Amino acid sequence: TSPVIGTPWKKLNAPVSEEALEGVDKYWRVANYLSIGQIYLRSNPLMKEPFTREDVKHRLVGHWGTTPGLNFLIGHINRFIADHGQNTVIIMGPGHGGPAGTSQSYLDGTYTETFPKITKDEAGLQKFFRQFSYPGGIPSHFAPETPGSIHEGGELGYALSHAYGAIMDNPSLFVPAIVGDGEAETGPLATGWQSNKLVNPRTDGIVLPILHLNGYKIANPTILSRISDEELHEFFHGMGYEPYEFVAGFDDEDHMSIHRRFAELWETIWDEICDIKATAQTDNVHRPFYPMLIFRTPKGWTCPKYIDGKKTEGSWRSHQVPLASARDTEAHFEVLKNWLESYKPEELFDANGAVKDDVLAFMPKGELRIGANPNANGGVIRNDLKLPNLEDYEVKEVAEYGHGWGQLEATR
Amino acid sequence: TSPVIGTPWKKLNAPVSEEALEGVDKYWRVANYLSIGQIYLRSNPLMKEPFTREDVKHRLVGHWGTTPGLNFLIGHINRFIADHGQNTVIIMGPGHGGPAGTSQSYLDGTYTETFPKITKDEAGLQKFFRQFSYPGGIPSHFAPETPGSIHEGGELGYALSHAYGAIMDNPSLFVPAIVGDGEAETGPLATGWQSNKLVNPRTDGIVLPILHLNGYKIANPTILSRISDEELHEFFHGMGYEPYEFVAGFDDEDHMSIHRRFAELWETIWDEICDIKATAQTDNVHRPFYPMLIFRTPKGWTCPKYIDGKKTEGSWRSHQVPLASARDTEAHFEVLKNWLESYKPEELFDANGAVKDDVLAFMPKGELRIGANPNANGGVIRNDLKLPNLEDYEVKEVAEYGHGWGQLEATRTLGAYTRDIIKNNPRDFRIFGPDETASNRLQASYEVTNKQWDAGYISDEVDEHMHVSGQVVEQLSEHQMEGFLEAYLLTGRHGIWSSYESFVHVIDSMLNQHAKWLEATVREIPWRKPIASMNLLVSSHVWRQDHNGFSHQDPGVTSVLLNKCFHNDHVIGIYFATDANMLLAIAEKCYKSTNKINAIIAGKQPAATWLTLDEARAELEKGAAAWDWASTAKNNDEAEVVLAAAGDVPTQEIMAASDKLKELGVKFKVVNVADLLSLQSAKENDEALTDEEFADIFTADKPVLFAYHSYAHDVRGLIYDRPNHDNFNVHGYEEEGSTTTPYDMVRVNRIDRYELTAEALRMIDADKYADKIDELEKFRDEAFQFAVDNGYDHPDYTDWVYSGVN
Ligand SMILES: Cc1ncc(C[n+]2csc(CCOP(=O)(O)OP(=O)(O)O)c2C)c(N)n1
Ligand SMILES: Cc1ncc(C[n+]2csc(CCOP(=O)(O)OP(=O)(O)O)c2C)c(N)n1
Numbered sequence A: 001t002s003p004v005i006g007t008p009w010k011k012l013n014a015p016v017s018e019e020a021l022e023g024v025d026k027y028w029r030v031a032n033y034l035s036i037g038q039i040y041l042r043s044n045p046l047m048k049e050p051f052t053r054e055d056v057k058h059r060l061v062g063h064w065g066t067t068p069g070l071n072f073l074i075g076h077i078n079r080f081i082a083d084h085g086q087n088t089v090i091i092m093g094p095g096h097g098g099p100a101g102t103s104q105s106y107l108d109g110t111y112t113e114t115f116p117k118i119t120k121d122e123a124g125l126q127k128f129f130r131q132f133s134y135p136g137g138i139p140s141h142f143a144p145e146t147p148g149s150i151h152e153g154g155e156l157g158y159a160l161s162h163a164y165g166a167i168m169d170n171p172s173l174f175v176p177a178i179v180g181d182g183e184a185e186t187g188p189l190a191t192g193w194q195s196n197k198l199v200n201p202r203t204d205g206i207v208l209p210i211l212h213l214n215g216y217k218i219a220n221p222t223i224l225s226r227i228s229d230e231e232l233h234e235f236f237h238g239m240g241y242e243p244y245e246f247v248a249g250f251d252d253e254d255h256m257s258i259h260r261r262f263a264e265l266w267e268t269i270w271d272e273i274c275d276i277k278a279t280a281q282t283d284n285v286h287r288p289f290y291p292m293l294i295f296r297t298p299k300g301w302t303c304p305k306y307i308d309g310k311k312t313e314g315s316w317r318s319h320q321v322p323l324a325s326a327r328d329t330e331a332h333f334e335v336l337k338n339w340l341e342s343y344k345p346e347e348l349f350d351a352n353g354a355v356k357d358d359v360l361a362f363m364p365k366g367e368l369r370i371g372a373n374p375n376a377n378g379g380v381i382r383n384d385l386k387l388p389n390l391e392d393y394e395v396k397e398v399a400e401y402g403h404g405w406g407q408l409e410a411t412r
Numbered sequence B: 001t002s003p004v005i006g007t008p009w010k011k012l013n014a015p016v017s018e019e020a021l022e023g024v025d026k027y028w029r030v031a032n033y034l035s036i037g038q039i040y041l042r043s044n045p046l047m048k049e050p051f052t053r054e055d056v057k058h059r060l061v062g063h064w065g066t067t068p069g070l071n072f073l074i075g076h077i078n079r080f081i082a083d084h085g086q087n088t089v090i091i092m093g094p095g096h097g098g099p100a101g102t103s104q105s106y107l108d109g110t111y112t113e114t115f116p117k118i119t120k121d122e123a124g125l126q127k128f129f130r131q132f133s134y135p136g137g138i139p140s141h142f143a144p145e146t147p148g149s150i151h152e153g154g155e156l157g158y159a160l161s162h163a164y165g166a167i168m169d170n171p172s173l174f175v176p177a178i179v180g181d182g183e184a185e186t187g188p189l190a191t192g193w194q195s196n197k198l199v200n201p202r203t204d205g206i207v208l209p210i211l212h213l214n215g216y217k218i219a220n221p222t223i224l225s226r227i228s229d230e231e232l233h234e235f236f237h238g239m240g241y242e243p244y245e246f247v248a249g250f251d252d253e254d255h256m257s258i259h260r261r262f263a264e265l266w267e268t269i270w271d272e273i274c275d276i277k278a279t280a281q282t283d284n285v286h287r288p289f290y291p292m293l294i295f296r297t298p299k300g301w302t303c304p305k306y307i308d309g310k311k312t313e314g315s316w317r318s319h320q321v322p323l324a325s326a327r328d329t330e331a332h333f334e335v336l337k338n339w340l341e342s343y344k345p346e347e348l349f350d351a352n353g354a355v356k357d358d359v360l361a362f363m364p365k366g367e368l369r370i371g372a373n374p375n376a377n378g379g380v381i382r383n384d385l386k387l388p389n390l391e392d393y394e395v396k397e398v399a400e401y402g403h404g405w406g407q408l409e410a411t412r413t414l415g416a417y418t419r420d421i422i423k424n425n426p427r428d429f430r431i432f433g434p435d436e437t438a439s440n441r442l443q444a445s446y447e448v449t450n451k452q453w454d455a456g457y458i459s460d461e462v463d464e465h466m467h468v469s470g471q472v473v474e475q476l477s478e479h480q481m482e483g484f485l486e487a488y489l490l491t492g493r494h495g496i497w498s499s500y501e502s503f504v505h506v507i508d509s510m511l512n513q514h515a516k517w518l519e520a521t522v523r524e525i526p527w528r529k530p531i532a533s534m535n536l537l538v539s540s541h542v543w544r545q546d547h548n549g550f551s552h553q554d555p556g557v558t559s560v561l562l563n564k565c566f567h568n569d570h571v572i573g574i575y576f577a578t579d580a581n582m583l584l585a586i587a588e589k590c591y592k593s594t595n596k597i598n599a600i601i602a603g604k605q606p607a608a609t610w611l612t613l614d615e616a617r618a619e620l621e622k623g624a625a626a627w628d629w630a631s632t633a634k635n636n637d638e639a640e641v642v643l644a645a646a647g648d649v650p651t652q653e654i655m656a657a658s659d660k661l662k663e664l665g666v667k668f669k670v671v672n673v674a675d676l677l678s679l680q681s682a683k684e685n686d687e688a689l690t691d692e693e694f695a696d697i698f699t700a701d702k703p704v705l706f707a708y709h710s711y712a713h714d715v716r717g718l719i720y721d722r723p724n725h726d727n728f729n730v731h732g733y734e735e736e737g738s739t740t741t742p743y744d745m746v747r748v749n750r751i752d753r754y755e756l757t758a759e760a761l762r763m764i765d766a767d768k769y770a771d772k773i774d775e776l777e778k779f780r781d782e783a784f785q786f787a788v789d790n791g792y793d794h795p796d797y798t799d800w801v802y803s804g805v806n
């Protein structure tokens, strides 16, 4: 049976603290630094001088165009899970943002538990950096080897169906389903929008679709990002959703101003969800409008704005790798060094190389963590079916009238 | 007169304090704990260990599906009364929430005053718990034994009529009328919604209807809870109300968050009410929209959510008792123990078992309390009517022109008498009638007062005697009139109400209920002082329904009234006005009486007058009396028959038959029974006629012919053990009638004068009088054919005047 974890569907009834958002910003910075170290670095994780081109990977593989947005959402969801004690499984629709998921597993402590050789220090950070998309390493996508993952995300169109499946008969589980805006063009997910007409708010859980609308696919913009905002809201409302919209990173607003704004928007959405759940205990015959979040951000949101005179951030040029060769020129290596120093890792890591304690104080503990949630590892939940005696259903006429008897239908 | 108590209609002009709401939450918890201890516990009130199944009642009876909501509302109303000093009477519509009312009486201190053996400690708490719905205990509903109660609430549909009655002529009294959502489906209360069109905000008080919309009846949901909120607000606004809505308990909101929210909503409503009252001092000609509160909560709001895997809270499964047997399993006892501990009684009671002082600090004191309010005990308010001299209204022509004179209408005399009572008693006496005051000829009171009407006025060619204030209320609903009058009497005032005989059945239930309020009061409740009597003028009776016919003829009110005559309670009186003077005497006696239901059956038709006032009173004290002027036999031995009568038309037929009997030399006696209940068994009824007196009135061996207004069954069931009862031959109504001439109406019921003379002749000698009997029988048919041919009754019948008229 699906377990009840924590205190489900609880309202905060308080402002989001400033200290928690301090922690969320520091988490976002350190998660971006880890997601870049995984793609680009093979040695010297904390850039002890001399930081040279010797420390960079020969073959840079991976994706970045979705990773900082995923890190933003995941850090905020982590603050939320710590505050509310919610039973939460995240489904990452753009699974090519694998460094985000591995950075989460590393930061919430589950990665070291599952993989003891990736310690939480300088050598462990070096191994964590080198092993991403490497011979004898871990995959690029959000893989079964990655704790907290039920969805690979490599082949696109099934984040929403997997979310609605994961909440079925599962009344305390909250699923934020992050959906790429390019993936939203695929045929499966377009019809997976309409699956709130097949779940009950009382007996099933709640899926919150987060449309990760960064505007671009590989080398092409997305249809949803280039239609009017009126059309987008009208479209999501015709499918039984209440659209909420968050826009960030498209100007020079301070990061804290963005974290605060998201905190307020998120708690508003949570209060609507909690109202839906409380109403469903009394009335579950009439369908509510579930909130869904439209998360408009620039693709590759913390990367350098321009590289080689080409618009990189906020463009499709940041999909896989900006600085396709930071190993073969000195200018690109300087761009990479400035990019890594823009997160100020000097204050996010201690002397021995561990992520500082105040960076992760806002984090959930124990079974509430993403990598520790039993619904992510559905084999520990599983129990055998209680099976009726087979002889009760046997077709006995063969035993006495002889083989070849009858005109029965097998599937009955 | 209704007293002015406290400081009426005052605005708070401040926020509701936090300390008061602390007290309100603690009150709500302790009231729920008391309401559960009453239902479930017989011992160990404070759950000293060992708390075992020994401490639980063997038979769990009572109701819980409304009790926590009632406790919530009552605690908040208590905070309000303490703050504002308001004169407030609560009417509890769902009276099956009795533990809420008894918990209030216990917590505000009035219960210990009324019942000293229920102390405020551990032993007193144990007695309070055990006595609820127990052998030798207190009832389950909100009973007359419960201080602060004017309404039983057992039989549903009359919270609103009782509220609007209690505020009438009562300008400082605030009445929150809590209405169940299932009860709102009943016919009476649906029309009791529309009674804000019959009260004036200046001269009358304010009723606040609180719809207690918890969604469920017994085993069924309510119509009002399952229609859209738009429909509900539109419905309440079409009836002259401003709907306010409060919703609580349907999520995990903190209790304080609920108490605070209710405080703001309540003070908003109070400010609208105070604005209405202040406006009414200047302008009272245009009707306001009174606020009414829709109080949406889950049924059984603090009970366990699920029991046996069945949804209990927020369902109809919590109506009577969750845990129907907490005595027969260990699991149910654990559920009960957890339920009791969820209120944390360990902090609500002190060591000795008294409710802690800080739990009741927010409570009203003195006369402002619900159980101490004088309007709840309307016998302490009551003062006697100042009555005009009866001799002023006597029909004096009988005294000089002889008995049987005239063609007067009996009810016009009562109209004049009641007019002068109104003149001497304004704002303490009121006349009700289901659109029938002017048809019962009680319109003489329009000389001194008006019909109270607060809907629109259009003209003066049609709106005479109507005014925004008045002492005559008149709506086409017998339920409305009866509830208005019952709440009028229960608050200390006086009244009459008139009705057609056939439609009094509409309120057979209500009368029954009021009799139960009186039977209970005269037996075991001395601290409740006597209230005025419920006076019902029954007119337009069965024998003269010319315009209407068979649908308007049913005198069965006498039967339903006879069922409430037991154990020497004397809460019922049934009087027959034979003429105007007898009506005067009866009405004087009835207006003086207390704690009774007096049905005065009088005709509105032109009828002869038989008695003088002194004769009428002399017949009155006995109930039955011999008419010596009409009897031809000097002593009981001479008479060959006794002719007894009860009612104006039976009296007329007995007298006309006596005239024919005189011509044949028959010696007879004439008896008139003004009061029916004097004919009751002497051992059963100590105020009925003794057996010697009854035998003196009716000769032991001689046959008695009895002509009766109602069904003869009611006479025969009453005299069964009386002497000579075998010889009684009762002639009454026999469900035979139509629209036809007045002689036909009594013809088809074998109660006409010819049939009565033939009956008496057959009682004496069928053989000797055979020719005369035959002549009478064929004359009846000739006199019916006369009416068929000519359209009116026979000259022999119409023109007949008694021989005693000079
Ligand atoms: C069905 C399918 N077609 C093609 C691809 C190849 N592919 C991998 S990532 C990607 C673009 C990702 O699009 P979007 O959802 O907009 O992601 P984001 O903007 O987060 O990078 C594509 C086309 C795929 N994974 N699945
Ligand atoms: C006229 C009438 N019919 C039936 C009953 C039986 N009865 C007693 S309580 C009750 C249900 C109470 O209904 P509601 O007003 O919704 O009360 P609540 O939800 O507060 O229990 C019923 C039908 C009654 N008291 N009166």
Ligand SMILES: [Mg+2]
Pocket: A180, A181, A182, A212, A213, A214, A215, A216, A217, A222
């Ligand atoms: Mg995209």
Ligand SMILES: [Mg+2]
Pocket: B180, B181, B182, B212, B213, B214, B215, B216, B217, B222
């Ligand atoms: Mg109800």
